[PDB]
Amino acid sequence: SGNGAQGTKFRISLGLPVGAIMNCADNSGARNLYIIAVKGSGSRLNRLPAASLGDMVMATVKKGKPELRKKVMPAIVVRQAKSWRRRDGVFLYFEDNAGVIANPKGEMKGSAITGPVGKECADLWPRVASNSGVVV
Partner 1 sequence: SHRKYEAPRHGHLGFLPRKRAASIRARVKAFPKDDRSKPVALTSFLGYKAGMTTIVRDLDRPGSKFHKREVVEAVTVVDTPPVVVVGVVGYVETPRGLRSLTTVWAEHLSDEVKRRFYKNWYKSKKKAFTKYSAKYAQDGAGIERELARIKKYASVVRVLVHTQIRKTPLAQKKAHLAEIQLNGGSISEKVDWAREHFEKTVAVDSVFEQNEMIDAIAVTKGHGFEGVTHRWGTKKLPRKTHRGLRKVACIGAWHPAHVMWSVARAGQRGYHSRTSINHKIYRVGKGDDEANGATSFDRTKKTITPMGGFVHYGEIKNDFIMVKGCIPGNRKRIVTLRKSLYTNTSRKALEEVSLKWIDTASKFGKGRFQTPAEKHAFMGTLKKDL
Partner 2 sequence: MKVEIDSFSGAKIYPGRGTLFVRGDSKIFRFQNSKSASLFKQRKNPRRIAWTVLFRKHHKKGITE
The residue range among 32-40, 113-121, 125-133 that interacts with RNA, by the rule CB under 7 A, is 32-40
Return the number of the residue (65 or 86) whose C-beta is nearest partner 2.
86
At residue 122's C-alpha, the angle toward residues 52 and 49, to 5°, is: 15
How far apart are CB 1 and RNA at their closest, in Å? 7
Map residues 97-116 to x or -, x wherever contact with partner 2 holds by CB under 8 A.
------------------xx
Longest Cα–Cα distance of the chain, Å, equals 43
If binding is defined by CB under 8 A, does position 34 make contact with partner 2?
no
The residues near 58 (Cβ < 8 Å, ≥ 6 apart) are 35, 36, 37, 38, 39, 72, 73, 74, 75
**Which listed option, partner 1, RNA, partner 2, none, makes contact with residue 11 (CB within 5 to 8 Å by class)?**
RNA
If binding is defined by CB under 8 A, does position 87 make contact with partner 2?
no
As a whole number of angstroms, the distance between CA 77 and CA 104 comes to: 14
As a whole number of angstroms, the distance between CA 98 and CA 92 comes to: 15
Residues that bind partner 2 (CB under 8 A): 79, 83, 88-96, 115-116, 133-134, 136
